[PDB]
Amino acid sequence: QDGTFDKLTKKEALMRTRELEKLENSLGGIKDMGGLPDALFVIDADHEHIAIKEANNLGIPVFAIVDTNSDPDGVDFVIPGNDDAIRAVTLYLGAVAATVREGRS
């Protein structure tokens, strides 16, 4: 925002804005805090076996909702759920949200 104001150019800075807005579109969730989250609540296993493969290699509790196609040897608190049927995943995440919004008691 400050660079496009007066620094060197108008149009090139605008190009950088319209491009790196895509960069900020990436990384949308993690963007607030210093990193190293307490735990993890991935919504599948096969699609992101790399995610669990990193969190267990680092020692973070994976709160997965395994499909039945998946490979539950890596997960931490496996949940024999169904990952498709978006209705279902919405229900799961709604319950999790209800829990976490006042887990502070």
Partner RNA sequence: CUUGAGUCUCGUAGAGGGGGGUAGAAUUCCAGGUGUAGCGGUGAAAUGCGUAGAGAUCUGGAGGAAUACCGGUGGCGAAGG
Partner RNA sequence: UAAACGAUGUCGACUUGGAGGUUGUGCCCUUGAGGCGUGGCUUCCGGAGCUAACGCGUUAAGUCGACCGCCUGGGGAGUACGGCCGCAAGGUUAAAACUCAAAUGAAUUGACGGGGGCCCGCACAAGCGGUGGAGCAUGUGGUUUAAUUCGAUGCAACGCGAAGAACCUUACCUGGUCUUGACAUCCACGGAAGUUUUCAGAGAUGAGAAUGUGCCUUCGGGAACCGUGAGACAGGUGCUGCAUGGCUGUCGUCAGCUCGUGUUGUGAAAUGUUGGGUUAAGUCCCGCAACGAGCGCAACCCUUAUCCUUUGUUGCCAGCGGUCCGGCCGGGAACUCAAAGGAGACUGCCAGUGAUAAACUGGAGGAAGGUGGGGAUGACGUCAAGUCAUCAUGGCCCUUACGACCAGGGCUACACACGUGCUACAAUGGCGCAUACAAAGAGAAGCGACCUCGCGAGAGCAAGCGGACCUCAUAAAGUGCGUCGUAGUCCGGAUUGGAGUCUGCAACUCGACUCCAUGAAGUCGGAAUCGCUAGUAAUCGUGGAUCAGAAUGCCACGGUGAAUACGU
Residues contributing to the site for RNA (CB under 7 A): 8-12, 14-15, 18, 22-23, 26-27, 50, 53-54, 57
**What's the maximum distance between 2 C-alpha atoms anywhere in the chain?**
57
**Joined tokens for residue 33:** 């805090």
The phi and psi torsions of 40 (rounded to 5 degrees) equal: -145, 140
Please, which residue, 48 or 76, has the CB nearer to RNA? 48
CB of 76 to RNA, least distance (A): 17
CB of 103 to RNA, least distance (A): 29
Please, which residue, 57 or 99, has the CB nearer to RNA? 57
**Joined tokens for residue 79:** 């949940």
d(CA 67, CA 87): 15
